Amino acid sequence: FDREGKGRVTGEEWLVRSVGAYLPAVFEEVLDLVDAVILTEKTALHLRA
Amino acid sequence: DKVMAGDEWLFEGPGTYIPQKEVEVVEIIQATVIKQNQALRLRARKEC
Amino acid sequence: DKVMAGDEWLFEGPGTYIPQKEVEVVEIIQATVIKQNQALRLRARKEC
């Protein structure tokens, strides 16, 4: 992020909920390290805009 | 049988080889563990 | 690729160069900082 404009930066994502995988690459992690919440019994989500 | 090449493949059964601290192919694992009731679940895997 | 001239232009990526205290082109900056939530706003600029 040099002057006024942005060099190349991009904000987009997706998730791997997959069992068994080292994760960190070149010292840094993916961005976070969490174990399974063991999801929804009778909950849901309300999507707005 | 005898092999002069190969990717990743494990095998058990026969034996005369002596687990040499120099080379035991890769790693060695002795005995059969799991009892009767011991159930096991396995995952797919893959990294990166 | 290789350059024998130039104005002001930065670049990252490859590397074999050793940040020599004599000349490291101009200045050096290691690692990637910003986490996930860290948002950044930039301005136009210009002086005088």
Coordinates of N, CA, C and O in Angstrom, one line a residue:
Chain A
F1 N 0.9 -1.1 0.0 CA 0.0 0.0 0.0 C 1.0 1.2 0.0 O 1.4 1.6 1.1
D2 N 1.3 1.6 -1.2 CA 2.3 2.7 -1.3 C 1.6 4.1 -1.3 O 1.5 4.7 -0.2
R3 N 1.3 4.7 -2.5 CA 0.7 6.0 -2.5 C -0.7 5.9 -3.1 O -0.9 5.1 -4.0
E4 N -1.6 6.5 -2.5 CA -3.1 6.5 -2.9 C -3.6 5.1 -3.2 O -4.4 4.6 -2.4
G5 N -3.2 4.5 -4.3 CA -3.7 3.2 -4.6 C -3.1 2.0 -3.9 O -2.2 2.2 -3.1
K6 N -3.7 0.9 -4.1 CA -3.3 -0.4 -3.5 C -2.4 -1.2 -4.4 O -2.9 -1.4 -5.5
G7 N -1.3 -1.6 -3.9 CA -0.4 -2.4 -4.7 C -1.1 -3.6 -5.3 O -1.5 -3.6 -6.4
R8 N -1.3 -4.6 -4.4 CA -2.0 -5.9 -4.8 C -3.0 -6.4 -3.8 O -3.9 -7.2 -4.2
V9 N -3.0 -5.9 -2.6 CA -3.8 -6.5 -1.5 C -5.3 -6.9 -1.8 O -6.0 -6.2 -2.5
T10 N -5.6 -8.1 -1.2 CA -7.0 -8.7 -1.5 C -7.6 -9.3 -0.3 O -7.0 -10.1 0.5
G11 N -8.9 -9.0 0.0 CA -9.6 -9.5 1.1 C -10.7 -10.5 0.7 O -11.8 -10.0 0.3
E12 N -10.5 -11.8 0.7 CA -11.4 -12.8 0.4 C -10.9 -14.1 1.2 O -9.8 -14.2 1.5
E13 N -11.9 -15.0 1.4 CA -11.6 -16.2 2.2 C -12.5 -17.4 1.9 O -13.4 -17.4 1.1
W14 N -12.2 -18.5 2.6 CA -12.9 -19.8 2.6 C -12.3 -20.7 3.7 O -11.2 -20.4 4.1
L15 N -13.0 -21.7 4.1 CA -12.5 -22.5 5.2 C -12.4 -24.0 5.1 O -13.2 -24.7 4.5
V16 N -11.3 -24.5 5.6 CA -11.0 -25.9 5.6 C -11.3 -26.5 7.0 O -10.7 -26.1 8.0
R17 N -12.4 -27.3 7.1 CA -12.9 -27.9 8.3 C -12.4 -29.3 8.3 O -13.0 -30.2 8.8
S18 N -11.2 -29.5 7.8 CA -10.7 -30.8 7.6 C -9.7 -31.3 8.6 O -8.7 -30.7 8.9
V19 N -10.0 -32.5 9.1 CA -9.2 -33.3 10.0 C -7.9 -33.8 9.6 O -7.8 -34.6 8.6
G20 N -6.8 -33.3 10.3 CA -5.5 -33.8 10.0 C -4.7 -32.9 8.9 O -4.7 -33.3 7.7
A21 N -4.0 -31.9 9.4 CA -3.2 -31.1 8.5 C -2.3 -30.1 9.3 O -2.9 -29.3 10.0
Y22 N -1.0 -30.2 9.2 CA -0.1 -29.3 9.9 C -0.5 -27.9 10.1 O -0.6 -27.4 11.3
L23 N -0.8 -27.2 9.0 CA -1.3 -25.8 9.0 C -0.3 -24.7 8.8 O -0.4 -24.0 7.8
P24 N 0.7 -24.4 9.7 CA 1.6 -23.3 9.5 C 2.5 -23.5 8.3 O 3.0 -24.6 8.0
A25 N 2.8 -22.4 7.6 CA 3.7 -22.3 6.5 C 4.6 -21.1 6.6 O 4.1 -20.0 6.7
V26 N 5.9 -21.4 6.5 CA 6.9 -20.3 6.6 C 6.8 -19.6 7.9 O 6.6 -18.3 7.9
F27 N 6.9 -20.3 9.0 CA 6.8 -19.7 10.4 C 5.4 -19.3 10.7 O 4.9 -19.6 11.8
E28 N 4.7 -18.5 9.9 CA 3.4 -18.0 10.2 C 2.3 -19.1 10.0 O 2.5 -20.0 9.3
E29 N 1.2 -18.9 10.7 CA 0.1 -19.8 10.6 C -0.8 -19.4 9.5 O -0.4 -18.4 8.8
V30 N -1.9 -20.0 9.3 CA -2.8 -19.6 8.2 C -3.3 -18.2 8.5 O -3.4 -17.3 7.6
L31 N -3.7 -17.9 9.8 CA -4.1 -16.7 10.3 C -4.7 -16.9 11.7 O -4.8 -15.9 12.5
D32 N -5.1 -18.1 12.0 CA -5.6 -18.5 13.3 C -5.6 -20.0 13.5 O -5.5 -20.8 12.5
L33 N -5.7 -20.5 14.7 CA -5.7 -21.9 15.0 C -6.8 -22.3 16.0 O -6.7 -22.0 17.2
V34 N -7.9 -22.9 15.5 CA -9.0 -23.3 16.4 C -9.5 -24.7 16.2 O -9.4 -25.3 15.2
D35 N -10.0 -25.3 17.3 CA -10.5 -26.6 17.3 C -12.1 -26.4 17.1 O -12.6 -25.3 17.2
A36 N -12.7 -27.5 16.7 CA -14.2 -27.5 16.5 C -15.1 -27.1 17.6 O -15.0 -27.7 18.7
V37 N -16.0 -26.2 17.3 CA -17.0 -25.7 18.3 C -18.1 -26.8 18.6 O -18.6 -26.9 19.6
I38 N -18.1 -27.8 17.6 CA -19.1 -28.9 17.7 C -20.6 -28.4 17.6 O -21.4 -28.5 18.5
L39 N -20.7 -27.6 16.6 CA -21.7 -26.8 15.9 C -23.1 -26.6 16.6 O -23.3 -26.4 17.8
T40 N -24.2 -26.6 15.7 CA -25.6 -26.4 16.0 C -26.6 -27.5 16.4 O -27.1 -28.2 15.5
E41 N -27.2 -27.5 17.6 CA -28.2 -28.4 18.0 C -29.6 -27.9 17.6 O -30.4 -28.7 17.1
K42 N -29.9 -26.6 17.8 CA -31.2 -26.0 17.4 C -31.0 -24.5 17.2 O -31.8 -23.7 17.7
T43 N -29.8 -24.1 16.7 CA -29.5 -22.7 16.5 C -29.6 -22.4 15.0 O -29.8 -23.4 14.2
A44 N -29.4 -21.2 14.6 CA -29.5 -20.8 13.2 C -28.9 -19.4 13.1 O -28.5 -18.8 14.0
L45 N -28.8 -18.9 11.8 CA -28.3 -17.6 11.5 C -29.3 -16.7 10.8 O -30.1 -17.2 10.0
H46 N -29.3 -15.4 11.1 CA -30.1 -14.4 10.5 C -29.2 -13.6 9.6 O -28.3 -12.9 10.1
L47 N -29.5 -13.7 8.3 CA -28.7 -12.9 7.4 C -29.4 -11.6 7.1 O -30.6 -11.7 6.9
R48 N -28.7 -10.5 7.1 CA -29.2 -9.2 6.8 C -28.5 -8.8 5.5 O -28.1 -9.7 4.8
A49 N -28.2 -7.5 5.2 CA -27.5 -7.0 4.0 C -26.3 -7.9 3.7 O -25.4 -7.9 4.4
Chain B
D1 N 10.2 -62.7 -2.8 CA 10.0 -61.4 -3.3 C 11.1 -60.5 -2.8 O 11.7 -60.7 -1.7
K2 N 11.3 -59.4 -3.5 CA 12.3 -58.4 -3.1 C 12.1 -57.2 -4.0 O 11.7 -57.3 -5.1
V3 N 12.3 -56.0 -3.4 CA 12.1 -54.8 -4.1 C 13.4 -53.9 -4.1 O 14.1 -53.7 -3.1
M4 N 13.6 -53.3 -5.3 CA 14.8 -52.4 -5.6 C 14.3 -51.0 -5.8 O 15.1 -50.2 -6.4
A5 N 13.1 -50.7 -5.5 CA 12.5 -49.3 -5.7 C 11.2 -49.2 -5.0 O 10.6 -50.2 -4.5
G6 N 10.7 -47.9 -4.9 CA 9.4 -47.7 -4.3 C 9.1 -46.4 -3.6 O 9.9 -45.7 -3.1
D7 N 7.8 -46.1 -3.6 CA 7.2 -44.9 -3.0 C 6.9 -45.3 -1.6 O 7.7 -45.9 -0.9
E8 N 5.8 -44.8 -1.0 CA 5.4 -45.1 0.3 C 4.5 -46.3 0.5 O 3.3 -46.2 0.1
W9 N 5.0 -47.4 1.0 CA 4.2 -48.5 1.3 C 4.8 -49.4 2.4 O 5.9 -49.7 2.5
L10 N 3.9 -49.6 3.4 CA 4.3 -50.4 4.6 C 3.9 -51.8 4.4 O 3.1 -52.2 3.5
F11 N 4.5 -52.7 5.2 CA 4.2 -54.1 5.2 C 4.6 -54.8 6.5 O 5.6 -54.3 7.2
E12 N 3.9 -55.9 6.8 CA 4.2 -56.7 8.0 C 4.2 -58.1 7.7 O 4.0 -58.5 6.5
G13 N 4.3 -59.0 8.7 CA 4.3 -60.4 8.5 C 5.6 -61.1 8.7 O 5.9 -61.5 9.9
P14 N 6.4 -61.5 7.7 CA 7.7 -62.2 7.9 C 8.8 -61.4 8.6 O 8.5 -60.3 9.0
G15 N 10.0 -62.0 8.7 CA 11.0 -61.3 9.3 C 12.2 -62.1 9.8 O 12.1 -63.1 10.4
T16 N 13.4 -61.5 9.5 CA 14.7 -62.0 9.8 C 15.6 -60.8 10.0 O 16.6 -60.8 10.6
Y17 N 15.1 -59.7 9.4 CA 15.8 -58.4 9.5 C 16.0 -58.0 11.0 O 15.1 -58.4 11.8
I18 N 17.1 -57.4 11.3 CA 17.3 -56.9 12.7 C 17.3 -55.4 12.6 O 18.1 -54.8 11.9
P19 N 16.3 -54.8 13.4 CA 16.2 -53.4 13.4 C 17.5 -52.7 13.7 O 17.9 -52.4 14.9
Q20 N 18.3 -52.4 12.6 CA 19.6 -51.7 12.7 C 19.4 -50.3 13.0 O 18.7 -49.6 12.2
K21 N 20.1 -49.7 14.0 CA 20.0 -48.3 14.3 C 20.4 -47.4 13.2 O 20.2 -46.2 13.2
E22 N 21.1 -48.0 12.2 CA 21.5 -47.3 11.0 C 20.3 -47.1 10.1 O 19.9 -46.0 9.8
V23 N 19.8 -48.2 9.6 CA 18.7 -48.2 8.7 C 17.7 -49.4 9.0 O 18.1 -50.5 8.9
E24 N 16.4 -49.0 9.2 CA 15.4 -50.0 9.5 C 14.2 -49.6 8.5 O 13.1 -49.8 8.8
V25 N 14.7 -49.1 7.3 CA 13.9 -48.6 6.2 C 13.4 -47.2 6.4 O 13.6 -46.4 5.5
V26 N 12.8 -46.9 7.6 CA 12.2 -45.6 7.9 C 12.1 -45.6 9.4 O 12.9 -44.9 10.1
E27 N 11.1 -46.3 9.9 CA 10.8 -46.4 11.3 C 10.3 -47.8 11.5 O 9.9 -48.5 10.6
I28 N 10.4 -48.2 12.8 CA 9.9 -49.6 13.2 C 8.9 -49.5 14.3 O 8.9 -48.6 15.1
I29 N 7.9 -50.4 14.3 CA 6.9 -50.5 15.3 C 6.5 -52.0 15.6 O 6.0 -52.7 14.8
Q30 N 6.8 -52.4 16.8 CA 6.6 -53.7 17.3 C 5.3 -54.0 18.0 O 4.6 -53.1 18.5
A31 N 4.9 -55.3 18.0 CA 3.7 -55.8 18.6 C 2.3 -55.3 18.1 O 2.2 -54.4 17.3
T32 N 1.3 -56.1 18.5 CA -0.1 -55.7 18.1 C -0.7 -55.2 19.4 O -0.8 -55.9 20.4
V33 N -1.2 -53.9 19.4 CA -1.8 -53.3 20.6 C -3.3 -53.5 20.9 O -3.6 -54.2 21.9
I34 N -4.2 -52.9 20.1 CA -5.6 -52.9 20.4 C -6.2 -54.2 20.9 O -6.0 -55.3 20.3
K35 N -6.9 -54.1 22.0 CA -7.6 -55.2 22.6 C -8.8 -55.7 21.8 O -8.7 -55.8 20.6
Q36 N -9.9 -55.9 22.5 CA -11.2 -56.3 21.8 C -12.1 -55.1 21.5 O -12.4 -54.8 20.4
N37 N -12.4 -54.5 22.6 CA -13.3 -53.4 22.6 C -12.8 -52.1 22.0 O -13.6 -51.2 21.7
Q38 N -11.5 -52.0 21.8 CA -10.9 -50.8 21.2 C -11.3 -50.6 19.8 O -10.8 -51.2 18.8
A39 N -12.1 -49.6 19.6 CA -12.6 -49.2 18.3 C -11.8 -48.0 17.8 O -11.3 -47.2 18.6
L40 N -11.6 -47.9 16.5 CA -10.9 -46.8 15.9 C -11.6 -46.2 14.7 O -12.2 -46.8 13.9
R41 N -11.5 -44.8 14.7 CA -12.1 -44.1 13.6 C -10.9 -43.4 12.9 O -10.0 -42.9 13.5
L42 N -10.9 -43.3 11.5 CA -9.8 -42.7 10.8 C -10.4 -41.6 9.9 O -11.5 -41.7 9.5
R43 N -9.5 -40.7 9.6 CA -9.9 -39.5 8.8 C -9.2 -39.6 7.4 O -8.3 -40.4 7.2
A44 N -9.7 -38.8 6.5 CA -9.1 -38.8 5.1 C -7.6 -38.4 5.2 O -6.8 -39.2 5.1
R45 N -7.4 -37.1 5.5 CA -6.1 -36.5 5.6 C -5.8 -35.5 4.5 O -6.7 -34.9 3.9
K46 N -4.5 -35.3 4.3 CA -3.9 -34.4 3.3 C -3.5 -33.0 3.9 O -4.2 -32.6 4.9
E47 N -2.5 -32.4 3.4 CA -2.0 -31.2 4.0 C -2.0 -30.0 3.2 O -2.8 -29.9 2.2
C48 N -1.3 -29.0 3.6 CA -1.1 -27.7 3.0 C -2.3 -26.7 2.8 O -3.3 -27.1 2.2
Chain C
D1 N 15.4 -11.9 -14.9 CA 15.3 -10.5 -15.0 C 16.4 -9.8 -14.2 O 16.9 -10.3 -13.3
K2 N 16.7 -8.6 -14.7 CA 17.8 -7.8 -14.0 C 17.6 -6.3 -14.5 O 17.3 -6.1 -15.7
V3 N 17.9 -5.4 -13.7 CA 17.8 -4.0 -14.0 C 19.0 -3.2 -13.8 O 19.7 -3.3 -12.8
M4 N 19.4 -2.4 -14.8 CA 20.6 -1.5 -14.8 C 20.2 0.0 -14.7 O 21.0 0.8 -15.0
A5 N 19.0 0.3 -14.3 CA 18.5 1.6 -14.2 C 17.1 1.7 -13.5 O 16.5 0.6 -13.3
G6 N 16.7 2.9 -13.1 CA 15.4 3.0 -12.5 C 15.1 4.1 -11.6 O 15.9 4.6 -10.8
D7 N 13.8 4.5 -11.5 CA 13.3 5.5 -10.7 C 12.9 4.9 -9.4 O 13.6 4.0 -8.9
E8 N 11.8 5.3 -8.8 CA 11.3 4.7 -7.5 C 10.4 3.5 -7.7 O 9.2 3.8 -8.1
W9 N 10.8 2.3 -7.4 CA 9.9 1.1 -7.5 C 10.4 0.0 -6.6 O 11.5 -0.4 -6.6
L10 N 9.5 -0.4 -5.8 CA 9.7 -1.5 -4.8 C 9.3 -2.8 -5.3 O 8.5 -2.9 -6.3
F11 N 9.8 -3.9 -4.7 CA 9.5 -5.2 -5.2 C 9.8 -6.2 -4.1 O 10.7 -6.0 -3.2
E12 N 9.0 -7.3 -4.0 CA 9.2 -8.4 -3.0 C 9.1 -9.7 -3.7 O 9.0 -9.8 -5.0
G13 N 9.2 -10.8 -3.0 CA 9.2 -12.1 -3.6 C 10.4 -13.0 -3.4 O 10.6 -13.6 -2.4
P14 N 11.2 -13.1 -4.5 CA 12.4 -13.9 -4.5 C 13.5 -13.4 -3.6 O 13.3 -12.4 -2.8
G15 N 14.7 -14.0 -3.5 CA 15.8 -13.6 -2.7 C 16.9 -14.5 -2.5 O 16.7 -15.7 -2.2
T16 N 18.1 -13.9 -2.6 CA 19.4 -14.6 -2.4 C 20.3 -13.5 -1.8 O 21.3 -13.8 -1.2
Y17 N 19.9 -12.3 -2.1 CA 20.6 -11.1 -1.7 C 20.8 -11.1 -0.1 O 19.9 -11.6 0.5
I18 N 21.9 -10.6 0.4 CA 22.1 -10.6 1.8 C 22.1 -9.1 2.2 O 23.0 -8.3 1.7
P19 N 21.2 -8.7 3.0 CA 21.1 -7.2 3.4 C 22.5 -6.7 3.9 O 22.8 -6.8 5.1
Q20 N 23.3 -6.2 2.9 CA 24.6 -5.7 3.3 C 24.4 -4.3 3.9 O 23.8 -3.4 3.3
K21 N 25.1 -4.1 5.0 CA 25.1 -2.8 5.7 C 25.6 -1.7 4.8 O 25.4 -0.5 5.1
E22 N 26.3 -2.0 3.7 CA 26.8 -1.1 2.8 C 25.7 -0.6 1.9 O 25.3 0.6 1.9
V23 N 25.1 -1.5 1.1 CA 24.0 -1.2 0.2 C 23.0 -2.3 0.1 O 23.3 -3.5 -0.2
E24 N 21.7 -2.0 0.5 CA 20.6 -2.9 0.4 C 19.6 -2.2 -0.5 O 18.4 -2.4 -0.2
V25 N 20.1 -1.5 -1.5 CA 19.3 -0.8 -2.5 C 18.9 0.6 -1.9 O 19.2 1.6 -2.6
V26 N 18.3 0.6 -0.8 CA 17.8 1.9 -0.2 C 17.6 1.5 1.3 O 18.3 2.0 2.2
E27 N 16.5 0.7 1.6 CA 16.2 0.3 2.9 C 15.6 -1.1 2.8 O 15.1 -1.5 1.7
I28 N 15.6 -1.8 3.9 CA 15.0 -3.2 3.9 C 13.9 -3.3 5.0 O 13.9 -2.6 6.0
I29 N 12.9 -4.2 4.7 CA 11.8 -4.4 5.6 C 11.4 -5.9 5.6 O 10.9 -6.3 4.5
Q30 N 11.7 -6.6 6.7 CA 11.3 -8.0 6.7 C 10.0 -8.4 7.3 O 9.4 -7.6 8.0
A31 N 9.5 -9.6 6.9 CA 8.3 -10.2 7.4 C 6.9 -9.5 6.9 O 6.9 -8.4 6.5
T32 N 5.8 -10.3 7.1 CA 4.5 -9.8 6.8 C 3.8 -9.5 8.2 O 3.7 -10.4 9.0
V33 N 3.4 -8.3 8.5 CA 2.8 -7.9 9.8 C 1.3 -8.1 10.0 O 0.9 -9.0 10.8
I34 N 0.5 -7.3 9.4 CA -0.9 -7.3 9.5 C -1.6 -8.6 9.7 O -1.5 -9.5 8.8
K35 N -2.4 -8.8 10.8 CA -3.2 -10.0 11.1 C -4.3 -10.1 10.1 O -4.2 -9.9 8.9
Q36 N -5.5 -10.5 10.7 CA -6.7 -10.6 9.8 C -7.5 -9.4 9.9 O -7.8 -8.7 8.9
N37 N -7.9 -9.0 11.1 CA -8.8 -7.8 11.4 C -8.1 -6.5 11.1 O -8.8 -5.5 11.0
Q38 N -6.8 -6.4 11.0 CA -6.1 -5.2 10.7 C -6.5 -4.5 9.4 O -6.0 -5.0 8.3
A39 N -7.3 -3.5 9.4 CA -7.7 -2.8 8.2 C -6.8 -1.5 8.1 O -6.3 -1.0 9.1
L40 N -6.5 -1.1 6.8 CA -5.7 0.0 6.6 C -6.3 1.0 5.5 O -6.9 0.6 4.6
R41 N -6.2 2.3 5.9 CA -6.7 3.3 5.0 C -5.5 4.1 4.5 O -4.6 4.4 5.3
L42 N -5.4 4.5 3.2 CA -4.3 5.2 2.7 C -4.7 6.5 2.1 O -5.8 6.6 1.6
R43 N -3.8 7.4 2.1 CA -4.1 8.8 1.5 C -3.4 9.0 0.2 O -2.5 8.2 -0.2
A44 N -3.7 10.1 -0.5 CA -3.1 10.4 -1.8 C -1.6 10.7 -1.5 O -0.8 9.8 -1.8
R45 N -1.3 11.8 -0.9 CA 0.0 12.3 -0.6 C 0.4 13.5 -1.4 O -0.4 14.3 -1.9
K46 N 1.7 13.7 -1.5 CA 2.4 14.8 -2.3 C 2.8 15.9 -1.3 O 2.1 16.1 -0.3
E47 N 3.9 16.5 -1.6 CA 4.4 17.5 -0.7 C 4.5 19.0 -1.2 O 3.8 19.3 -2.2
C48 N 5.2 19.8 -0.5 CA 5.5 21.2 -0.8 C 4.4 22.2 -0.8 O 3.4 22.1 -1.4

